[PDB]
Design a protein around this ligand. Sequence first.
Ligand SMILES: Cc1ccc(C)c(Cc2nn(C(C)(C)C)c3ncnc(N)c23)c1
Ligand SMILES: C[C@]12CCC(=O)C[C@@H]1CC[C@@H]1[C@@H]2CC[C@]2(C)[C@@H](O)CC[C@@H]12
Ligand SMILES: O=C(O)c1c[nH]c2ccccc12
Length: 249
Amino acid sequence: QPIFLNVLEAIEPGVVCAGHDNNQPDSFAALLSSLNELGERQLVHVVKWAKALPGFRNLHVDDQMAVIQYSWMGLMVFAMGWRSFTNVNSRMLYFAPDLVFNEYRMHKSRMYSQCVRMRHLSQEFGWLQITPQEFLCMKALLLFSIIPVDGLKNQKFFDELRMNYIKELDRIIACKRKNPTSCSRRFYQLTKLLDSVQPIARELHQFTFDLLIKSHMVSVDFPEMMAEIISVQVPKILSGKVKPIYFHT
Ligand SMILES: Cc1ccc(C)c(Cc2nn(C(C)(C)C)c3ncnc(N)c23)c1
Ligand SMILES: C[C@]12CCC(=O)C[C@@H]1CC[C@@H]1[C@@H]2CC[C@]2(C)[C@@H](O)CC[C@@H]12
Ligand SMILES: O=C(O)c1c[nH]c2ccccc12
């Protein structure tokens, strides 16, 4: 910053619609299918976003795809939680302008427990009085928060990149604090918030995987990219071959 901050703010994705038909009565098939589609559409914005981040191209072409394919879920949840807080003060999950989840939908989606956790994450944005800038940095960092236990092709470039994004988050915290104790206190809070995202993602990873398996049974449509990623990338995470990077133990 100003350089770093300018970029993140300049590349922040715009509003993405789900294409849901809010005129038809709610149903598991319709709601989940809409969530899946929204996922596809968003995945495209995430790829272009990540491929605009400072130094992202320092990563091997294969690792570039790897990081996105593993962290998309977390990235989308953290971003969904930020929208819910700013647009409806966490009252409901603001997936998209045409896809807002109230208590009833949280129930009909059959993933109420997961909606509760995500909504709790949204509430954190308010309790911790997270700023738009702190949010942007954290989200950028989420892209580099999950890798295979055996590392990537060019692991070194990844470490350097992750290290630099952590440094940037530090400057964001320092560029608005006089006390040397307030800074350390904030960083602690932010890393705690970042970690709390992984557990929520894993539960969604397990849920979507199971849904994909019995998709044909429950009449739930899965976009092309979503189906491929969930049947090839997600399993690696659920089997322990790929794991998130926690700040705290
Ligand atoms: C070769 C290359 C160059 C840049 C990026 C971001 C990637 C990862 C990447 N690309 N794509 C397509 C092109 C199918 C939309 C992806 N779709 C889903 N997940 C991905 N990680 C990616 C790959
Ligand atoms: C990432 C999405 C879609 C993008 C968003 O705003 C967050 C939201 C979180 C729940 C995901 C959904 C995509 C489709 C999934 C993966 C369903 O299959 C089950 C959980 C859904
Ligand atoms: O700030 C970042 O994210 C950076 C990634 N690669 C770099 C090289 C020099 C300075 C900052 C960065």
